[PDB]
Amino acid sequence: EVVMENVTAFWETPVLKDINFKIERGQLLAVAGSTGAGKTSLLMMIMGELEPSEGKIKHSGRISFCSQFSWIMPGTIKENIIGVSYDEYRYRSVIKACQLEEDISKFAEKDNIVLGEGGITLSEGQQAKISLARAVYKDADLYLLDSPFGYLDVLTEKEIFESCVCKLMANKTRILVTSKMEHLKKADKILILHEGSSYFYGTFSELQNLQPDFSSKLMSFDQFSAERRNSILTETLRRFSLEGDA
Ligand SMILES: Nc1ncnc2c1ncn2[C@@H]1O[C@H](COP(=O)(O)OP(=O)(O)OP(=O)(O)O)[C@@H](O)[C@H]1O
Ligand SMILES: [Mg+2]
Numbered sequence: 001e002v003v004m005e006n007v008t009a010f011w012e013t014p015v016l017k018d019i020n021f022k023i024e025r026g027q028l029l030a031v032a033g034s035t036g037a038g039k040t041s042l043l044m045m046i047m048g049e050l051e052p053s054e055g056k057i058k059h060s061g062r063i064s065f066c067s068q069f070s071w072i073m074p075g076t077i078k079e080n081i082i083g084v085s086y087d088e089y090r091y092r093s094v095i096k097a098c099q100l101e102e103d104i105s106k107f108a109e110k111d112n113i114v115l116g117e118g119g120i121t122l123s124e125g126q127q128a129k130i131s132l133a134r135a136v137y138k139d140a141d142l143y144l145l146d147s148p149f150g151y152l153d154v155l156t157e158k159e160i161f162e163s164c165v166c167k168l169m170a171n172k173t174r175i176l177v178t179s180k181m182e183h184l185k186k187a188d189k190i191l192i193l194h195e196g197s198s199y200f201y202g203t204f205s206e207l208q209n210l211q212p213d214f215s216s217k218l219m220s221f222d223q224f225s226a227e228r229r230n231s232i233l234t235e236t237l238r239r240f241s242l243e244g245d246a
Helices: 039-046 077-082 087-099 101-105 124-137 154-168 181-186 204-210 213-219 224-236
Strands: 002-009 016-023 028-033 056-057 062-064 142-146 175-176 189-194 198-200
Touching: 002 039, 016 039, 016 198, 028 077, 028 181, 039 142, 039 175, 062 124, 062 198, 077 087, 077 124, 077 198, 087 101, 087 124, 087 154, 087 181, 101 124, 124 154, 124 213, 142 204, 181 224, 189 204, 198 204, 204 213
Parallel strands: 028 175, 028 189, 062 142, 142 175
Antiparallel strands: 002 016, 002 056, 189 198
16 A cells, blocks of 8 residues: 655755655556656655655655666576575466566577577567566565656556566556556556646546536547657646747
């Protein structure tokens, strides 16, 4: 469980302001909003790299964080995912749901291929999948997934969101930062951020009803690139003011 009550915070204008939400056990919070809105900072705060200046974060547990920038340790594919604690059944289910089995089978050494300076040189998509695999393999109470689908094509991102984030991780408490509407449509609750504050918290069906013009703007949106979706989100969110647009 994660509880946020009237939370505000600034780094070093506050980065986050008046945040209020409660996520139940085994629920999926999809977070979306404009660039610089505080999305990653929200995660940083759950991880305790950011002290709240007001309000209380009622949380305790082991957290696993997948960052939005992929990274790779020198060592094998298996090692990059497992670290040093190995369970065969867990491992298998994670590489399956993160769609790595095909990638792995294409190598002679399979998941014992060594990566790094003397390494095979992996695609951005592969590295993203391994990074997510590492985060999902870690046994944790809370999964914080910050835009993990970055360099994947539409089908692969889809199969991972469904098999991993929704199916395999069904009983975990997770927060996913995303700009994909389909992911919002599937989440238990969504949170829309802009300039530090929440402009919606609730369900996707609920958002469509309470802010029909806002929703109308974001619906073939998912067929745009990550950059264009974040640009569209940002522009629509900027309309929340007293100013005249364009
Ligand atoms: N570790 C940090 N130390 C100091 N300031 C930070 C830190 N991380 C983020 N910020 C600042 O906080 C603001 C919000 O950044 P944040 O990464 O939380 O937004 P975001 O919504 O995740 O952005 P994006 O979606 O474009 O990656 C930015 O203006 C940034 O400069
Ligand atoms: Mg971010």
